[PDB]
Design an enzyme around this catalytic site. Structure first.
Site, PDB file in Angstrom:
ATOM      1  CG  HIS A  89       0.082   4.845 -43.467  1.00 29.98           C
ATOM      2  ND1 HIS A  89      -0.719   4.874 -42.285  1.00 29.98           N
ATOM      3  CD2 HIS A  89       1.280   4.435 -43.101  1.00 29.98           C
ATOM      4  CE1 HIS A  89      -0.268   4.320 -41.539  1.00 29.98           C
ATOM      5  NE2 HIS A  89       0.608   4.310 -42.094  1.00 29.98           N
ATOM      6  N   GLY A 123      -4.163   2.934 -34.768  1.00 30.93           N
ATOM      7  CA  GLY A 123      -3.347   4.585 -33.329  1.00 30.93           C
ATOM      8  C   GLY A 123      -2.338   4.474 -33.312  1.00 30.93           C
ATOM      9  CB  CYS A 143       0.735   3.671 -38.184  1.00 29.48           C
ATOM     10  SG  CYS A 143       0.169   2.366 -38.556  1.00 29.48           S
TER      11      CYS A 143
HETATM   12  C1  LIG Z   1      -1.305   2.672 -37.918  1.00 29.78           C
HETATM   13  O1  LIG Z   1      -1.834   3.338 -37.056  1.00 29.78           O
HETATM   14  C2  LIG Z   1      -1.880   0.989 -38.233  1.00 29.78           C
HETATM   15  C3  LIG Z   1      -1.836  -0.386 -37.777  1.00 29.78           C
HETATM   16  C4  LIG Z   1      -1.896  -1.605 -37.578  1.00 29.78           C
HETATM   17  C5  LIG Z   1      -3.863  -1.117 -37.559  1.00 29.78           C
HETATM   18  C6  LIG Z   1      -3.577  -3.525 -36.562  1.00 29.78           C
HETATM   19  N1  LIG Z   1      -2.042  -3.489 -35.777  1.00 29.78           N
HETATM   20  C7  LIG Z   1      -0.595  -2.817 -36.483  1.00 29.78           C
HETATM   21  O2  LIG Z   1      -0.406  -2.938 -36.669  1.00 29.78           O
HETATM   22  N2  LIG Z   1      -1.577   0.556 -39.749  1.00 29.78           N
HETATM   23  C8  LIG Z   1      -3.081   0.471 -40.796  1.00 29.78           C
HETATM   24  O3  LIG Z   1      -3.873   0.629 -40.419  1.00 29.78           O
HETATM   25  C9  LIG Z   1      -2.527   0.264 -42.273  1.00 29.78           C
HETATM   26  C10 LIG Z   1      -2.710   1.560 -42.884  1.00 29.78           C
HETATM   27  C11 LIG Z   1      -2.798   1.449 -44.353  1.00 29.78           C
HETATM   28  C12 LIG Z   1      -3.446   3.105 -44.770  1.00 29.78           C
HETATM   29  C13 LIG Z   1      -2.976   2.722 -46.745  1.00 29.78           C
HETATM   30  C14 LIG Z   1      -1.726   2.074 -46.808  1.00 29.78           C
HETATM   31  C15 LIG Z   1      -1.177   0.852 -46.132  1.00 29.78           C
HETATM   32  C16 LIG Z   1      -1.613   0.878 -45.040  1.00 29.78           C
HETATM   33  N3  LIG Z   1      -3.542  -0.446 -42.778  1.00 29.78           N
HETATM   34  C17 LIG Z   1      -2.703  -2.056 -42.436  1.00 29.78           C
HETATM   35  O4  LIG Z   1      -1.382  -2.131 -41.513  1.00 29.78           O
HETATM   36  C18 LIG Z   1      -2.948  -3.464 -42.840  1.00 29.78           C
HETATM   37  C19 LIG Z   1      -3.792  -2.635 -44.674  1.00 29.78           C
HETATM   38  C20 LIG Z   1      -3.831  -4.675 -44.820  1.00 29.78           C
HETATM   39  C21 LIG Z   1      -5.129  -5.344 -45.296  1.00 29.78           C
HETATM   40  C22 LIG Z   1      -4.539  -6.687 -45.711  1.00 29.78           C
HETATM   41  C23 LIG Z   1      -4.272  -7.366 -45.198  1.00 29.78           C
HETATM   42  C24 LIG Z   1      -3.367  -6.765 -43.649  1.00 29.78           C
HETATM   43  C25 LIG Z   1      -3.738  -5.322 -43.762  1.00 29.78           C
HETATM   44  N4  LIG Z   1      -3.011  -5.136 -43.446  1.00 29.78           N
END
Ligand SMILES: *C(=O)[C@H](C[C@@H]1CCNC1=O)NC(=O)[C@H](CC1CCCCC1)NC(=O)c1cc2ccccc2[nH]1
Ligand SMILES: *C(=O)[C@H](C[C@@H]1CCNC1=O)NC(=O)[C@H](CC1CCCCC1)NC(=O)c1cc2ccccc2[nH]1
Lengths: 303, 303
Positions: free
Chosen positions: B41, B143, B145
């Protein structure tokens, strides 16, 4: 989101740990530069455990008996010295993995990471706090003495505690890395009591702010209180009296959330008098007091 | 004595962590040998977040956009490849601090240590468990991930989880180090639900045995029960049905303490139906289920 007991990474301390043996006794030591620090109680044998005279025990002793091992490697002890309740064994080879470090004395309520070690090797790492009675609530078995507690600021490892003993109530006592014990405790096989188990109010308040940052807000009341009315009730629940300085430390948390400090105090006043009711806060059914204001901010915002 | 949430030392993993950036997105990666693993991602931009076609996103992409940094050092990406939901960025320089390691898939109920990282740098370490709904209850911010979960056996680091996302209920989901997600979850900005929050009974029983090893024995009843009578009540409290295999795993704990497994089950039957009553067990007012039988034995006896 989330909130959990988080320790500092254990890598910088792991390379500083060694096994110290003085005859039958085996524990752990800290190899910083060319010195290995360990509890002086290494030189005690069954016969002299009740009231040991460490001076006399050393006038018989030589730096040829003390055996240090960095892994299956062995360092050479070349010159010992007792400093307060610590031993300082000068070694031939300086630790190549010696980190930027400093010795500091923490105060009641402050938290630190503990790296539990046995035979010089790491078992695990956990978050701890210096209780008001100057003991710490840890997990230590035999052979654990010498293990260290620390905090990490940027590049500096700040060593603050070395394990020495367990009190009868299951709590643990130790010194700072200069050899001075925390509290009234002393290195002798006497029965030393811990005292009352006081709760760190400023810490509880901080963990409540963490709850609100993380969505848990059922405990929030529309009530407010005064410093004094709070302290008059909290004192029967063995809570640390809150002060104006604690209120200021909570300054940033109060503003990031919009909830005034005396508002949380009223919310805490009701949780103490009326209870939690089986309800949970951040997965806990009791009021956690092992998070400092600064632990909250770091875990909820950055490194 | 004592019992606390204890993580594995974070040193072996800390030297394997890097910052990965692909345009605007910045996360963490694992540099093992000459490969850097990270969540695919990384290649997603605001526009393509709801339903991304990673294949198509890569047919536009080149290993010249991906920027890796080991500290203020920069490695050279020389050849990328998508494997399931992970990216494998071949780098020029092999990690000198690459440890003996292996990739393994953990099952529900098993525990692991998490090293939370941001921008490639470690923030802290905590103990976690793979919940029955295939999510984990962690502390992760933006940040985060790329951060990894692991277990350490002797000299081998066993990597088992890489963080990918947060579900709407505050829980977190991820994959193993081969790119396959745990549970039904998928890397897309859809709303995916966790399901019921089941409690790991074999873990709770183990933590009760830890309580008794550590002196807490008020919950012990003179009653006994049958597998079935227990499961008939536990099922309304959303508890994982106990089996004959769980009973055997508890074999060693039952004998070290003298308390038969079905005896603890009856003691747990009463704590569930009649409650704890504000009483505490190992400093907790709820029934902890994040300790495996094997976590109990290691913390209560050795490294
Ligand atoms: C990466 O660093 C983050 C970690 C998250 C942020 C908040 N706490 C965490 O554990 N990951 C994300 O932001 C993902 C990124 C997406 C990119 C495209 C493919 C899917 C993952 N997003 C989510 O974790 C996310 C999307 C979403 C939509 C609706 C409800 C919850 C939700 N969470
Ligand atoms: C060192 O490895 C251990 C760590 C202990 C074992 C149980 N859990 C721990 O935290 N330390 C000890 O065994 C000390 C050693 C003594 C040597 C002589 C000088 C004083 C320390 N002993 C105790 O911690 C001890 C003695 C004692 C007597 C009565 C009640 C409790 C008690 N604890």
């Amino acid at each position: 989101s989330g909130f959990r007991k988080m320790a500092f990474p254990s890598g910088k301390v792991e390379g500083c740990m060694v096994q110290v043996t003085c005859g039958t006794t085996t524990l752990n030591g800290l190899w910083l530069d060319d010195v290995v620090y360990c509890p002086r109680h290494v030189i005690c044998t069954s016969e002299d455990m009740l009231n040991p005279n460490y001076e006399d025990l050393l006038i018989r002793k030589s730096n040829h008996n003390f055996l240090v091992q960095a892994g299956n490697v062995q360092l050479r002890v070349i010159g010992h010295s007792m400093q307060n309740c610590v031993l300082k064994l000068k070694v031939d080879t300086a630790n190549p993995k010696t980190p930027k470090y400093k010795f500091v004395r923490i105060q009641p309520g402050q938290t630190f990471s503990v790296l539990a070690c046995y035979n010089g090797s790491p078992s695990g790492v956990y978050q701890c706090a210096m209780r008001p009675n100057f003991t710490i609530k840890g997990s230590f078995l035999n052979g654990s003495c010498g293990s260290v507690g620390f905090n990490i600021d940027y590049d500096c490892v700040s060593f603050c505690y070395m394990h020495h003993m367990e009190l009868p109530t299951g709590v643990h006592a130790g010194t700072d890395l200069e050899g001075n014990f925390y509290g009234p405790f002393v290195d002798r096989q006497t029965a030393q009591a811990a005292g009352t188990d006081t709760t760190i109010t400023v810490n509880v308040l901080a963990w409540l702010y963490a709850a609100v940052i993380n969505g848990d807000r059922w405990f929030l009341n529309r009530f407010t209180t005064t410093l004094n009315d709070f302290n008059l009730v909290a004192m029967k629940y063995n809570y640390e009296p809150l002060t104006q300085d604690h209120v200021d430390i909570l300054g940033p948390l109060s503003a990031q959330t919009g909830i005034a400090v005396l508002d949380m105090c009223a919310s805490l006043k009701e949780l103490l008098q009326n209870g939690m009711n089986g309800r949970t806060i951040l997965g806990s059914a009791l009021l956690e007091d092992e998070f400092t204001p600064f632990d909250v901010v770091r875990q909820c915002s950055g490194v």
